[PDB]
Design a protein around this ligand. Structure first.
Ligand SMILES: [Mg+2]
Ligand SMILES: [Mg+2]
Ligand SMILES: [Mg+2]
Ligand SMILES: [Mg+2]
Ligand SMILES: [Mg+2]
Ligand SMILES: [Mg+2]
Ligand SMILES: [Mg+2]
Ligand SMILES: [Mg+2]
Ligand SMILES: [Mg+2]
Ligand SMILES: [Mg+2]
Ligand SMILES: [Mg+2]
Ligand SMILES: [Mg+2]
Ligand SMILES: [Mg+2]
Ligand SMILES: [Mg+2]
Ligand SMILES: [Mg+2]
Ligand SMILES: [Mg+2]
Ligand SMILES: [Mg+2]
Ligand SMILES: [Mg+2]
Ligand SMILES: [Mg+2]
Ligand SMILES: [Mg+2]
Ligand SMILES: [Mg+2]
Ligand SMILES: [Mg+2]
Ligand SMILES: [Mg+2]
Ligand SMILES: [Mg+2]
Ligand SMILES: [Mg+2]
Ligand SMILES: [Mg+2]
Ligand SMILES: [Mg+2]
Ligand SMILES: [Mg+2]
Ligand SMILES: [Mg+2]
Ligand SMILES: [Mg+2]
Ligand SMILES: [Mg+2]
Ligand SMILES: [Mg+2]
Ligand SMILES: [Mg+2]
Ligand SMILES: [Mg+2]
Ligand SMILES: [Mg+2]
Lengths: 208, 343, 328, 132, 177
RNA sequence: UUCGCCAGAGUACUACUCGCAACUGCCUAAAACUCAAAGGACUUGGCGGUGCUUCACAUCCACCUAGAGGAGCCUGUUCUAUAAUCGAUAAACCCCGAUAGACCUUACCAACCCUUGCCAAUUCAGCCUAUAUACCGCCAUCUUCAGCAAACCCUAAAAAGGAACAAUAGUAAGCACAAUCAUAGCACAUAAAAACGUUAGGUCAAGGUGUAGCUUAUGGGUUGGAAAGAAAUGGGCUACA
RNA sequence: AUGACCCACCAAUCACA
């Protein structure tokens, strides 16, 4: 809020500005954008025009960061991606042509898929009624769910590793185990789902 | 220790303690009083008790056409000067301890009956020195405020009149007593009634009115019988110019309802001329001291009737058991005959 | 208060003569602009509030406008609306409504004669036309107004302009016009520069958060960047900062085509990267097309980042963080 | 509530000088400094001396011209001389005013061992900025 | 309104028909009074709060050289004059109401306050108005356009005629010596 | 026109009587004694585990991040302890008066000393003695709350209330808010500002003082002592990797 | 659930001979 409410967020996408001539409503729209004499917030240091940056990877990076260390958290992320990569290159050359067609070597797609699998469907909110606190099944927003996934990943691979064991190691492990749905993270997701079925009657207490 | 000292204003402000929290909620009594005396009041520039005389200050700059030198008074001369100053202080203490007399209205601590003196000139330059004002009721009144808790306003009820038949009353209310006085004066002059006076001493005819819960009952007297009335009514009458009257108030004696009720009543008087005109007859007055001789008071401007009034053998009128009891000598109260001071 | 104004003008003129004399200038060519410099030099008050500093000005500007006398010496009020308590405003309303009726009549006669000869003058939008503020109107009638008052009046002018506009009508509603000044956010292009037989170099200066950066870019060179006399891979060890430096070039696809020298001071590493980022962006605007400039602005490349460290506050810990609060 | 150097709102009758009507947070913004001297500047010395001197001057002047002082004193210090400047009510005959001018200037000159100038500006009644 | 019944010629099928004989009788008197006040150089104030005829009345007044208040009537305008209008002021010598009601259907304040101020009051009191405090009432229809236009025109002409007669008699008095 | 009722409040739909298919009953219905009121309606507040709307933007719930509460230390309270200061002590005390105690500071304790005893003069100096519930000075708090208040005007009477914008009685100067100023350009943010009052809130130990107290002492000096941890606790620091 | 008692508005100036 060193920006007045007048200031719009910038659009960093290069593809949007490069190829305008085929869209009428969007031409009209960004015409109205700049021509409105509209002020623009200065593009943040984290975000780049880079063809290489995944906003999800960056979010995760941030949620991993303790104190002020981007350098250290970006290190750990980088190392983890490299570790998943090399773990799958190991699993590729000791395999046979069929499994060489099957196995995924893109660490990015592995990260994404492993998060999609770990995100909860349904959730729980405490509701006070008649002086008692019941836990009630609540549908969740998308953002809340992605958040729950990432936070659960990091909480586990911070908490449950042996102190000798480094972070990118444990994290690459859990990424690959959650890729295949057998990870402890996924067990947590299921504990939620089961607690949500156990209480399904109480779904009536929710007024919204 | 010279730096350690202060201004007089600071020191007095300090000592008086008018701004404390004691004064606000009335957390201390009104019989406790202390005052501020100027300590520069009697002092002159140059004066000191060492006794010096400075050419520009104590003494004139030139004596006999020359320049006076710096000099000092004799011991006994300074003795006399200090004697003078001490006697000056004692004189100011003699002036301060004398309290001016307050003319007492009804009672010593009542404000009722007291004169405020003429109301203030109106914006047009219009001036009433002919009007007097009397206070009828002053009252401390309260309201419960969100912040301050109890909040004390004075409200006074006042009446003005010139003695010549125009009087009126009004009420005024303010935090300060002085302020409410002003307000109620200046406001009173705006509601004036004209009171018709028979022969300029009494009212015209007997009046009985019930205003809210107050009953006033007035009777019209002859020339000598001065002002026998509730004390408020006497006050108001003296302001109107009504010199001879009898009025008994019953029911609630509440002051505002009394003066409203009274003015309503007096306003509604029906003059002899008005009566003459509505009946279209001569109205003829029989004095007892003048015998059978028929004084003609009012005559009906316009055409007089040739028709006599229907003679009612026995009238149907509302009678007050009080007046009947009075007429037949059944009022034995020890409070009624009492000799009182003059009007 | 009229004698006052007269006198004040007399003495302002006498005074302006005197002042012009001591300052040693021609009394005729003396302006308000000159009066000001003269006082500022004679009575030099540093005080931050400009209204509290010494002023000698024409009494009409100094004193507030006065309601003139409202009635003759006999007591009869001059203006027929006097007793309304607002004559000025209700007159305006009266004449406005009058002109509305007039318009309606005339245009109805022209409806019966088969003539619509007028046009809609109601679009002045390219002139950047707006209505007066309430403050302005209040100054034009020399009278206080109410919000609902102003509202009423404006609504009425709207009713007026929404009909066929007469000449005297157009002129009438146009007292109540103002024009909003220039609205364009287009930047000011740095003129490209040719130096010592070298062609096409441009300059730019970024500032971010205690870091200042001056960047000179050569269009004629290959891709490399020299920051404070060393290579940009050496000066910016962190990937993130190199990506920051990369952002504007990669955005314009100039990534191989330009050769830059930089001077950056103060702040930390990330702040310097940010500074050079902004400066580079501002320097590359000379080489590019006017449209891509708008694009860089819309990517937030050309705006300084206002976010700066807040001052710690006494009785707190961190400029926001509070000392621990004990309930009981 | 901050109370410092404030003149509180009365029933609305209270006469208030331009000085007294401005709370400390207005110093250097609207009202200016009642003293001027080099001492409080960055690299400079003997601030303390000049402060004490100041305090004594206000006290002294207030006692030497009883009742006739309009507003607080103005003390300008320039290259070893102090010009005191005062707003004075007309109370005394000009005899008493000149007597006190001379008396003061000499007295203080010998006290503080520097030339002292005194400048009296005379005023009918306390100049009134507000309320009243 | 109860106090209007003496002025009703009767009621035709639910409508109340004012008695015109009486309207004429009264109107003659109101006009007479208005005129004499005009001749005596005194302030006349047309007052109505009815928004149809507001413009019509403001116009009419300005044409007689008389004043109009057609707008919202500020609270203390008549009673507290010197604060609203100014330090010393003349107050109207006569007040004409073309409608005795305010748009909320209570009596217009100015009636109670003109009475309060000892100012005589002419006014057109329709069938549902309260005539009591009005000095010279003229019963008749205030709602319909030819009626209001009529009453406006009449008071206009009366005023103008009086001011003329005063000019002419003044001229005569000047030639007398 | 009648009839039945009512003469302060309690005591009392009670005690005694008469009558009654009532036998813990109905009916009829006192007094001693106690009080200076008891009652009725209203008004403005405040409050309401009352209802209906609208909100909370670090803020209640939902939610995010880092901590405290457990350990060692550091530093402050409370206790207990000492011959051995004082003050703060819900929010609005608790690294607080102190941006600062080895002697000094220093006010405390114990021994000792000195009595026109800091000054131009003074049957006078001096007092960190009592009262912050006598106060000035500075503040805290409601509070980034929007109101306070003079002068008027209105009300079938007024304790008090005073808006309706297609407007129904309100005008109002002033102070606050607002605006401006500052943070070296705007803007935003932050700072500053924030009336009247509320809490007899804090401070006679910043200084100054009202009232009341001491005067070979409750005053002025010198020398040396002020310990300590059963226990409870606040805030921090460093950690537990 | 709870939270001794007690708390409030009944006095008038300054200045001059
Ligand atoms: Mg007595
Ligand atoms: Mg921090
Ligand atoms: Mg009608
Ligand atoms: Mg009775
Ligand atoms: Mg009894
Ligand atoms: Mg019973
Ligand atoms: Mg019984
Ligand atoms: Mg018995
Ligand atoms: Mg919180
Ligand atoms: Mg920690
Ligand atoms: Mg902890
Ligand atoms: Mg701990
Ligand atoms: Mg302690
Ligand atoms: Mg103490
Ligand atoms: Mg204590
Ligand atoms: Mg407290
Ligand atoms: Mg010690
Ligand atoms: Mg010692
Ligand atoms: Mg001692
Ligand atoms: Mg206190
Ligand atoms: Mg306000
Ligand atoms: Mg009432
Ligand atoms: Mg009021
Ligand atoms: Mg106001
Ligand atoms: Mg600024
Ligand atoms: Mg701002
Ligand atoms: Mg602040
Ligand atoms: Mg502000
Ligand atoms: Mg206390
Ligand atoms: Mg205490
Ligand atoms: Mg003391
Ligand atoms: Mg501890
Ligand atoms: Mg703390
Ligand atoms: Mg109990
Ligand atoms: Mg209680």
């Amino acid at each position: 809020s060193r920006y007045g409410p007048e200031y719009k967020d910038p659009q960093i996408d290069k593809e949007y500005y490069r190829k305008p001539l085929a869209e009428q409503t969007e031409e009209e729209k960004y015409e109205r954008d700049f021509k409105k004499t509209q002020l623009i917030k200065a593009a943040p240091a984290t975000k780049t025009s880079s063809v290489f940056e995944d906003p999800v990877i960056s979010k995760f990076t941030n949620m991993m960061m303790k104190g002020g260390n981007k350098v250290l958290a970006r290190s750990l992320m980088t190392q983890t991606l490299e570790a998943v990569k090399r773990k799958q290159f190991a699993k590729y050359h000791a395999a046979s042509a069929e499994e060489q067609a099957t196995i995924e070597r893109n660490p990015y797609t592995i990260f994404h898929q492993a998060l999609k699998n770990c995100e909860p469907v349904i959730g729980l909110v405490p509701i006070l009624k008649g002086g008692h606190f019941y836990q009630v099944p609540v549908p969740l927003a998308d953002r809340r769910r992605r958040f729950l996934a990432m936070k659960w990943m990091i909480a586990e691979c911070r908490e449950k590793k042996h102190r000798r064991v480094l972070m990118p190691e444990k994290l690459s492990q859990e990424l690959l185990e959650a890729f295949h749905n057998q990870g402890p993270v996924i067990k947590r997701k299921h504990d939620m789902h089961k607690m949500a079925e156990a209480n399904r009657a109480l779904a009536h207490y929710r007024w919204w | 220790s010279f730096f350690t000292k202060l201004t007089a204003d600071e020191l007095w402000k300090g000592a008086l303690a008018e701004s404390g929290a004691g004064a606000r909620k009335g957390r201390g009594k009104r019989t406790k009083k202390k005052r501020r005396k100027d300590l520069n009041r009697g002092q002159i520039i140059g004066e000191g008790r060492h006794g010096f005389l400075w050419p520009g200050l104590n003494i004139p700059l030139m004596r006999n056409g020359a320049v006076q030198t710096i000099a000092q008074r004799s011991k006994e001369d300074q003795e006399k000067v200090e004697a003078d100053m001490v006697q000056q202080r004692e004189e100011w203490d003699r002036r301060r301890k004398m309290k001016v007399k307050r003319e007492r209205g009804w009672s010593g601590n009542t404000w009722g009956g007291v004169s405020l003196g003429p109301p203030d000139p109106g914006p047009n330059g219009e001036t009433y020195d002919d009007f007097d004002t009397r206070i009828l009721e002053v009252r401390n009144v309260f309201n419960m405020t969100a912040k301050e808790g109890r909040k004390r306003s004075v409200r006074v009820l006042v009446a003005v009149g010139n003695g010549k038949g125009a009087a009126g009353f009004a009420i005024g209310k303010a935090t300060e007593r002085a302020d409410a006085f002003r307000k109620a004066k200046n406001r009173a002059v705006h509601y004036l009634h004209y009171i018709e006076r028979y022969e300029d001493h009494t009212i015209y005819h007997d009046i009985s009115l019930k205003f809210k819960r107050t009953h006033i009952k007035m009777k019209k007297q002859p020339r000598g019988y001065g002002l026998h009335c509730h004390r408020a009514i006497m006050t108001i009458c003296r302001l109107i110019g009504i010199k001879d009257l009898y009025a008994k108030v019953s029911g609630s004696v509440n002051m505002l309802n009394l003066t409203r009720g009274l003015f309503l009543g007096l306003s509604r008087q029906e003059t002899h001329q008005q009566l003459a005109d509505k009946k279209s007859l001569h109205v003829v007055e029989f004095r007892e001291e003048c015998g059978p001789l028929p004084i003609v008071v009012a005559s009906p401007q316009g055409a007089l009737r040739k028709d006599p009034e229907p003679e009612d053998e026995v009238p149907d009128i509302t009678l007050d058991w009080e007046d009947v009891k009075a007429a037949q000598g059944m009022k034995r109260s020890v409070w009624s005959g009492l000799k009182r001071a003059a009007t | 208060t009229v004698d006052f104004i007269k006198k004040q003008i007399e003495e302002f003129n006498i005074g302006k003569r005197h002042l012009a004399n001591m300052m040693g200038e021609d009394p005729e060519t003396f302006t308000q602009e000159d009066i000001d410099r003269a006082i500022a030099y004679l009575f030099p008050s540093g005080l931050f509030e400009k209204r509290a500093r010494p002023i000698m000005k024409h009494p009409e500007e100094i004193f507030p406008k006065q309601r003139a006398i409202q009635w003759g010496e006999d007591g009869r009020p001059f203006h027929f609306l006097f007793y309304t308590g607002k004559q000025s405003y209700y007159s305006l309303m009266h004449d406005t409504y009058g002109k509305l009726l007039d318009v309606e009549k005339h245009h109805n006669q022209l409806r019966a004669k088969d003539l619509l000869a007028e046009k809609t003058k109601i679009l002045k939008d390219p002139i950047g036309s707006r209505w007066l503020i309430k403050e302005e109107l209040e100054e034009m009638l020399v009278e206080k107004l109410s919000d609902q008052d102003y509202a009423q009046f404006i609504r009425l002018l709207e009713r007026l302009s929404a009909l066929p506009c007469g000449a005297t009508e157009e002129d009438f509603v146009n007292r109540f016009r103002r024009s909003i000044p220039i609205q364009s956010k287009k930047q000011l292009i740095e003129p490209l520069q040719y130096d010592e037989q070298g062609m096409a170099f441009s300059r730019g200066e970024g500032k971010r958060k205690t870091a200042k950066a001056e960047v000179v870019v050569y269009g004629q060179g290959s891709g490399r960047i020299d920051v404070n006399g060393v290579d940009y891979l050496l000066y910016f060890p962190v990937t993130q900062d190199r990506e920051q430096l990369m952002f504007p070039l990669h955005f314009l696809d100039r990534l191989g085509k330009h050769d830059m020298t930089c001077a950056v001071s103060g702040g930390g590493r990330s702040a310097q990267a940010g500074a050079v980022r902004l400066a580079m962006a501002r320097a590359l605007c000379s080489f590019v097309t006017e449209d891509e400039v708008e694009w860089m602005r819309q990517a937030g490349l050309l705006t300084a980042d206002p976010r700066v460290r807040e001052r710690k506050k006494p009785g707190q810990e961190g400029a926001r963080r509070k000392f621990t609060w004990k309930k009981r | 509530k901050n109370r410092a150097a404030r003149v509180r709102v009365s029933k609305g009758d209270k006469p208030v000088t331009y000085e007294e009507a401005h709370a400390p947070h207005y110093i250097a913004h609207r009202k200016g400094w009642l003293s001027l001297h080099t001492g409080n500047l960055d690299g400079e010395d003997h601030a303390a001396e000049r402060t004490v001197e100041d305090v004594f001057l206000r006290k002294f002047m207030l006692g030497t011209f009883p009742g006739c002082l309009a507003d607080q004193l103005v003390l300008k210090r320039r290259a070893n001389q102090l010009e005191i400047c005062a707003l004075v009510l007309r109370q005394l005959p000009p005899h008493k005013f000149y007597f006190l001018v001379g008396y003061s200037e000499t007295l203080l000159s010998h006290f503080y061992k520097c030339p002292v100038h005194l400048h009296l500006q005379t005023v009918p009644s306390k100049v009134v900025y507000k309320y009243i | 309104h109860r106090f209007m019944e003496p002025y009703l010629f009767g009621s035709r099928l639910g409508q109340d028909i004012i008695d015109l004989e009486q309207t004429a009788a009264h109107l003659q008197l109101a006009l007479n009074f208005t005129a004499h006040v005009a001749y005596r150089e005194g302030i006349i104030l047309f007052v109505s709060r009815h928004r149809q005829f507001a413009h019509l009345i403001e116009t009419t007044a300005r044409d007689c050289g008389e004043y109009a208040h057609t707008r919202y009537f500020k609270g203390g305008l008549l009673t507290n004059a010197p604060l609203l209008l100014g330090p010393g002021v003349r107050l109207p010598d006569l007040i004409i109401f073309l409608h005795t009601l305010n748009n909320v259907f209570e009596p217009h304040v100015a009636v109670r306050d003109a009475a309060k101020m000892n100012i005589p009051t002419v006014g057109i009191v329709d069938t549902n108005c309260n005539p009591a405090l009005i000095t010279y009432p003229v019963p008749g229809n205030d709602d319909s356009p030819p009626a209001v236009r009529l009453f406006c025109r009449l008071f206009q002409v009366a005023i103008s005629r009086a001011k003329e007669k005063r000019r002419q008699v003044e001229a005569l008095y000047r030639l007398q010596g």
